[PDB]
Amino acid sequence: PFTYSIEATRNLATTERCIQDIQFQLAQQNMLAYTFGEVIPGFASAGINGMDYRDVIGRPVENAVTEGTHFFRDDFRVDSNAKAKVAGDIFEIVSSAVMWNCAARWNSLMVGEGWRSQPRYSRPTLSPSPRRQVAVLNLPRSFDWVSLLVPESQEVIEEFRAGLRKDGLGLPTSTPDLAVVVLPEEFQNDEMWREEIAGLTRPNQILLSGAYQRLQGRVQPGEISLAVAFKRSLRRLYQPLYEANVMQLLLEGKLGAPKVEFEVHTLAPEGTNAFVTYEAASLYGLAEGRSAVHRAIRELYVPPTAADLARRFFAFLNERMELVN
Amino acid sequence: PFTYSIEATRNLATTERCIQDFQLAQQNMLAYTFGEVIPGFASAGINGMDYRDVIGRPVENAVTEGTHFFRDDFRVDSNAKAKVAGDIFEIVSSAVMWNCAARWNSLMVGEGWRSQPRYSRPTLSPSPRRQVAVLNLPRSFDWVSLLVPESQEVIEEFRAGLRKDGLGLPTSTPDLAVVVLPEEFQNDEMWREEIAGLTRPNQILLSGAYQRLQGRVQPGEISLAVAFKDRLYQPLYEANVMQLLLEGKLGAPKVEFEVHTLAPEGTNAFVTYEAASLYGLAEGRAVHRAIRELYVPPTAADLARRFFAFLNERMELV
Ligand SMILES: [Ca+2]
Ligand SMILES: [Ca+2]
């Protein structure tokens, strides 16, 4: 469970143990199923929804360390580098699950199924419409977000990349960790995008991490609205800022997307200089010089609680999806 | 000298020593090691020497001095040696480009082509309006102050309008800038004289040359910005910022960016720096890269002949 249980750990089969004896390995798939198997932060109890998000993200590693100490005692040993990489993966996966349930509750409201009240969040004021449904896509590592686009838009990028290569120029690259896109019209009556998950069980982990495959080749460029980069400890400042401008140049510029925004989530920013740096206007918006300009990175967001993450994403959808007819 | 001399070190006053108390006095190190030697413009052995050994010579000479004068307890951290080596890497390379510009400017005003050492004579049509100045910029320097006041008013109005809507002006801080010599300075001989070495007056002359051109450079007269170096995207981003502000908002014909390094950590840096300039793609009019090259100078002579080739090609547009 979210709180460590000796009886639940004892009932775990060897394939379910959060610590895999090989040196020892942190089985993050079992860590999420053990800690968040019945708890989606922000959509659970009031104590968990209002808990410090750093303690919520750090709970699976703390539960795994307790299990390894129980079974192996002083033999159990993991490096700080291993505990850091897993915590960063959990920070991204858990936050993506919160946004997934936000989209599910949002999509339910858009199709006319009302506003779920447990837990209590402010009902969006935007007029409901099935065409305003969204999909939260946790993108794998080194994933080409161009593959999300419809074939006629991939050909524009492919011809543009080929022409630049003939002049010795490279197509600027960009790899966000997550993308929020308008739900394709052919999927606006599929109930899977409206169902909130009760916890990060193994089937639900596969559902969320693989949802990007369902939308490959089906997204219009203008339907991409938000990209997210997860840095558990933002030391490493200019790659997201550069890649945010790259996405806006290719989507808003070469593909005519109305607005493509970018934000960085972090748990411990190293100073306040990163907030000033991320106030910079989008380089493409300044280059076009015609339409209204927004920042390359809309916010350096430090989630205090999981409920604030859900509230903030609900407010984003209520304001951003108004631009969709 | 470039080669350590016990006799020369003994003649130095205590204030002229490379080791002070330990601290690496880089101004004394450059005057000791390169007081009579500008790499690429000195002996053939130094011009063709491995550039890492040339940049690493002042630190080695300073360590030798500290060893000879503080045998029992001399010690300098590897981080302190790395910081001074990085500063010497910028200053020495900036001095090479200074003498390149001086020999270039001498040719532009019709004084012929100096032949010692031998470099390929530019095929460009000489013209005093094609002279250039090499400006080593201080840390956190606002290069917009180089621009004429009318152009500064455009940037400040641009930043004020952005700040009114909660937007920040994108920042960029190159280490060095190559600009066309202002027309009021195109007959002053200081820009045509090659320095014989990095003596203390010549160090001040090169480090303070930017103050002579503040408020006097037209935006289109900026041609090349240089940065001396997991930390890969800040120069790439600031390169696009300079091109956006100069080529875009100020109408500069071409502003190129350069990153010089003595040791690239990996190989993905060269592939990453092949990216086209973001502004050039947005304008859609002859697009060039954001960073024209990730340059690893093998020798000081290669630094000189590469900068000569850039000027011969770039200054034809003027
Ligand atoms: Ca991802
Ligand atoms: Ca500098």
Numbering used by the authors:
A (entry chain A): 2 to 23, 34 to 246, 249 to 338
B (entry chain B): 2 to 22, 35 to 242, 248 to 303, 305 to 337
Task: Quote the original article.
For the filament-forming sequence-specific DNA endonuclease SgrAI, the process of filamentation both accelerates its DNA cleavage activity and expands its DNA sequence specificity, thus allowing for many additional DNA sequences to be rapidly cleaved. Under basal conditions, SgrAI is a homodimeric and sequence-specific restriction endonuclease of 74 kDa with two active sites, one in each subunit. Each active site cleaves bound duplex DNA containing any one of 17 different 8 bp recognition sites. Three of these sites, known as primary sequences or primary sites, have the pattern CRCCGGYG (where R = A or G and Y = C or T) and can be cleaved by SgrAI in the absence of filamentation.
